[PDB]
Amino acid sequence: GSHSMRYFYTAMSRPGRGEPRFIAVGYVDDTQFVRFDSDAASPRMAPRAPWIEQEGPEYWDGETRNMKASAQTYRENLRIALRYYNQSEAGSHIIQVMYGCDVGPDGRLLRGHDQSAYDGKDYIALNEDLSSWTAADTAAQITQRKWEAARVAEQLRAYLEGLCVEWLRRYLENGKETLQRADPPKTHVTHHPISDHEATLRCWALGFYPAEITLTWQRDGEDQTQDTELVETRPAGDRTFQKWAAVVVPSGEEQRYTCHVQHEGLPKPLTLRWE
Amino acid sequence: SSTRGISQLW
């Protein structure tokens, strides 16, 4: 299938409680493979997946150096952001950044990302062209004019087209046993009455990888979109994910309901009923 | 290098 590499940075100021915390995680698809935390005893870019551990001293030294540099830069950005928004120095604020690349089945760059936020709101985003910027407000427009003057987009694109794609491809090869393996959902339907008149049918998907999945209920073959309770996909802790979808049905009409499961691990979609 | 050895002031 296709694949993505993403890094996620989180910087949070905490006045009176020392300098901003900087935490960084790296993912390939839905598999975390590195982390960095400035609040750790000995902050270093550290492995969180078996296939990354083979990388040598120079690797970890490099990545760590990047994380420390970025840490300092985003501490200054927090200061900068206070001035742009006319905010006081007593409040706690957060800068978030996500970036990375998507490749196709053949390892070709499908598209690149570089998005930043301030206090949970969009701040500035590299456009899909990797040459221009979308700024969310007049403060971000200030950053934009700085980044235009400095050919920042130019640098990003050279990364997203070069090192990002190359390293992702290397990771996909080093971790092929897992990163290139989809585990299909294990599926079943449960039934619990609410009253004389109504019963809950709940369609389960367990143990699947990657997280992307579609669970839908049809009644008489018609999607029950506005009528289905759909819980957030949740990690199991063993690499896999879980989800369910529930519908409230009239007692005696359970066989008019079917559950439909779409997932990459499944050759074709599955249809389930209550047994 | 896998992260970007880039990082920019706002």
Partner: protein, 99 residues
């Protein structure tokens, strides 16, 4: 300005009394990132709980997985206790084994 946590409490594998498992509390969709999560065993705070590294979703909201080894019995009840700046009192979600 702020977003309150969604809370799910559940087991890694389907639960079988007497057979060992992992108990999970998955908190998501919250902002800012500071959060307090306890896993509870008959109302008591479990000591050896770990958690995933802080990450966030496309909408910038944060998510964390808190987990611990446990063995379900027919009598012992479990819960997740969550506090956040958005919440006046800690919010408690019971694990429901039937699910």
């Amino acid at each position: 300005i702020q977003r309150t946590p969604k809370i799910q409490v559940y087991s890694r594998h389907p639960a079988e009394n007497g057979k060992s498992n992992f108990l999970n509390c998955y908190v998501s969709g919250f902002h800012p990132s500071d959060i307090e999560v306890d896993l509870l065993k008959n109302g008591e705070r479990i000591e050896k709980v770990e958690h995933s590294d802080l990450s966030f979703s496309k909408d910038w909201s944060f998510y964390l997985l808190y987990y611990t080894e446990f063995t379900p019995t027919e009598k012992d009840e479990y819960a997740c206790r969550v506090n956040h700046v958005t919440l006046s009192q800690p919010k408690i979600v019971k694990w429901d084994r039937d699910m």
